[PDB]
Amino acid sequence: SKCPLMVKVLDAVRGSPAVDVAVKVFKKTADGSWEPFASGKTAESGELHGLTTDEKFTEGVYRVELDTKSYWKALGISPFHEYAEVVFTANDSGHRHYTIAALLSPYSYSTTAVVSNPQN
Amino acid sequence: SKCPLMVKVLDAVRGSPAVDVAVKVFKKTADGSWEPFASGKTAESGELHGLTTDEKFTEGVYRVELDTKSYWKALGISPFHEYAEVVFTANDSGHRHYTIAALLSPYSYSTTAVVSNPQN
Amino acid sequence: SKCPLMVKVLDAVRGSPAVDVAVKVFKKTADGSWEPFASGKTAESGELHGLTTDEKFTEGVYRVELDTKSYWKALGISPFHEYAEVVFTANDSGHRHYTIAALLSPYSYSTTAVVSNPQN
Amino acid sequence: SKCPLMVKVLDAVRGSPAVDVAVKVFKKTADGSWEPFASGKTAESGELHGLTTDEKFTEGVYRVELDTKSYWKALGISPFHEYAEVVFTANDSGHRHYTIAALLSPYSYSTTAVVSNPQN
Ligand SMILES: N[C@@H](Cc1cc(I)c(Oc2cc(I)c(O)c(I)c2)c(I)c1)C(=O)O
Ligand SMILES: N[C@@H](Cc1cc(I)c(Oc2cc(I)c(O)c(I)c2)c(I)c1)C(=O)O
């Protein structure tokens, strides 16, 4: 695809894009600590665009945190999970473009990853 | 563990097994069409064991229909699917044990097959 | 300009779009029988477009059938289901645009819908 | 029945329980840190029963972490996610039962919570 790191969030109760979800991305440092990498909020389409350029998105372990609790909390639903979280290693083989899709439900959530090579 | 076929249904919105969901089993005939094989409704545990006996369950194509629409209509929710349907070929490679599991949400559902192998 | 019905299919084992998944759509008729509506195959993006147009896609019960067995059998994988079927009611509340997403795995498949308005 | 906390994992590629999957439960401590709580690996049934007891399992925010990466590698399969974490608040509505389920695939995973009522 185009964006190096793309996050898409869906709402399985209303069958619509989960708009305004707090997304935070962190990067593991040499000593094992968690350093804030980037963050945003999903738009009307349930997508988050512009987290990182390929230059900035270097090889390493990443952590994407979606604040699922606030989403449900705003609608008057009390969810189970405090947050949804996806931890993964990136560009260890070579530079790839990732899409992290997540489907939300008060007591459940499933997450998938689409890895696509930018070059031939 | 005794009955070769079991249906386990869960509700993703409330964090609980889905109770009294209509489950109808259809088996494909030789002339081409389908014919009623069994029926029942999920219990308190969200399970439905005791459909058929290891003897009446012969090899062939099957169809497990779950009336998901009624289930949500009862909670004030207008779901998306008319029903969840699972079609598969059973016991082509000798006798087995299949537990089909469904995860329900108004606008989405995940179905899963679990095959057990009784020591013959 | 965007078409009413869309199908997006991902592969969970490989983490990429499912290319060449055979797709068949049906429409329920007055008799309570099924009539051939459309058909196609997912492109490289794992998507399917031009299944139909706004004028042809009226109110009614539809059945999108996905040939998921051939897909796996082609890769050397022996799946469980013969195909993944999605039955739903369209253009209930007047005109709408639909998106059927299906996530594939050998013994499991998760399908979700995203209903959106063309003007809202 | 007498297990306050339960974890069940399934493999979506082989269609059977995820055996020998390492589980580690943490509990947010008084000073805000994560303290070890329970550890174990999925039995043949892909589940853990001896996790904790109705008395040791008190109120608080727990963290369940499944080591999926190691599960997949020991099969020759290189997975996407580093691991699967599930963080939740427990016993906020009295002393009830908790079942955490997970459906694993190389590039995707689903989780759901089933919260029962012991004496109901
Ligand atoms: N007597 C059985 C009943 C039961 C069977 C299954 I199989 C199961 O597992 C899942 C996990 C996920 I994640 C799903 O999406 C689905 I559908 C089913 C669960 I929980 C409970 C027991 O308690 O073991
Ligand atoms: N970009 C286009 C096409 C597209 C639609 C969806 I909807 C989507 O999201 C999911 C999320 C999960 I979780 C799945 O299992 C599956 I399959 C698809 C993705 I990625 C891409 C659009 O915006 O319509």
Measured from the Cβ of residue B103, the count of other Cβ atoms closer than 10 Å reads 26
Domain span at residue A43?
A: 1-120
Strand (E) or helix (H) holding A12: none
Q: How far is the CA of B16 from the centre of ligand 1 (A)?
A: 11
- Which residues on adjacent β-strands are paired with residue D118? none
**Method for structure elucidation:** X-ray
> What is the CA angle B25-B30-B35, rounded to 5?
25
Spatial contact of A80 and D96, defined as CB atoms under 8 Å apart: no
φ/ψ of D17, rounded to 5, equals -55, 150
Query: What DSSP designation does A79 have?
Result: -
Residue corresponding to tokens 């509340």: C93
Residue A10 maps to which CATH number?
Answer: 2.60.40.180
Cβ < 6 Å from ligand 1: which residues? B 8, 10, 47, 99, 101-103, 110, 112, 114; D 8, 10, 99, 101-103, 110-112, 114
- Give the burial string for B7-29 (b: 16+ CB within 10 Å, else e): bbbbbbbebbbbebbbbbbbbbe
Per CB-CB distance under 8 Å, the chain B contacts of A105 are 12-13, 105, 108
Give CA–CA dist B70/B47, Å, rounded.
Answer: 17
Q: What is the resolution in angstroms?
A: 2.5
Structural domain count, chain B:
1
Number of residues assigned to chain B = 120
A8 is in an annotated binding site: yes
For B33, C30, C37, D66, the CA distances from C5, given in Å and listed in that order, are 29, 22, 12, 38
Give CA–CA dist D107/D96, Å, rounded.
Answer: 33
Q: Encoding tokens for residue D18? A: 């995820």
With 0-12 CB in 10 A as exposed, 13-18 as middle and 19+ as buried, what is A70? Answer: middle
Residue B15 to residue A110, Cβ atoms within 8 A: no
C-alpha dihedral sign at C68, D14, D82, A58:
negative
> Helix, strand, coil proportions of chain C in percent (round to 5)?
5, 50, 45
Residues of A with CB under 8 A from a CB of B: 11-15, 80, 103, 105-108, 110
Q: Which chains touch A (3 or more CB pairs under 8 A)?
A: B, C, D
Chain breaks in chain B (C to N over 2.5 A) after: none
- Which residues on adjacent β-strands are paired with residue A31? none
* Chain mean position to CA D78: 22
Q: Which ligand is nearest to the CA of D107?
A: 2
**CB-nearest partner of C113 from B107, B110, B113:** B107
Residue B107 to residue C85, Cβ atoms within 8 A: no
- Give the burial string for C61-73 (b: 16+ CB within 10 Å, else e): ebbbbbebbebbe
Spatial contact of B98 and B57, defined as CB atoms under 8 Å apart: no
With 0-12 CB in 10 A as exposed, 13-18 as middle and 19+ as buried, what is B40? Answer: middle
